[PDB]
Design a protein around this ligand. Structure first.
Ligand code: CL
Length: 160
């Protein structure tokens, strides 16, 4: 609980050595804060790859959802952290997991303009036709945000 609180913020801040000490001293790797974020969520969101790999190696739940439904893959796709996206997928992250608004990681990558992430999620079986609670596909979010290259790629993937 107490070390868990410290682990969350050391993961967010990229404090590799502190993460390691906290885990060796028994910090709960799946500790949650007020919004259900776990250390893996915060490391994946803030782009700290080594810490993501350490947490995965010592039992972090790769498919944990926070209070908003976001999984660590949602957060890394949204924030554009490609290597972390790949490690999470390799650790078994659900490529088509959905959040509170029905969005998948591909929705968020398209909304945020992250073409490399879009291309990698597609090659790992992301659902181009998934519809969020607003009735929007990833293609719709690419158009809404003026991301024409992502939109063209998503079109080609839907066609074939
Ligand atoms: Cl684009």
């Amino acid at each position: 609980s107490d070390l868990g609180k410290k682990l969350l913020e050391a993961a967010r801040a990229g404090q590799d050595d502190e993460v390691r000490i906290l885990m060796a001293n028994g910090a709960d790797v799946n500790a949650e804060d007020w919004m259900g974020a776990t250390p893996l969520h915060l490391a994946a969101q803030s782009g700290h790859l080594e810490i993501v790999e350490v947490l995965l190696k010592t039992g972090a739940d790769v498919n944990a959802h926070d209070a908003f439904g976001w999984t660590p893959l949602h957060l890394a796709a949204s924030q554009g952290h490609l290597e972390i996206v790949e490690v999470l997928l390799k650790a078994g992250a659900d490529v088509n997991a959905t959040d509170m608004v029905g969005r998948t990681p591909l929705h968020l990558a398209a909304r945020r303009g992250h073409l490399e992430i879009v291309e990698v999620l597609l090659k790992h079986g992301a659902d181009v036709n998934a519809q969020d609670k607003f009735g929007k596909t990833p293609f719709d979010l690419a158009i809404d945000n003026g991301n024409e290259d992502i939109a063209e790629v998503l079109q080609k993937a839907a066609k074939l």
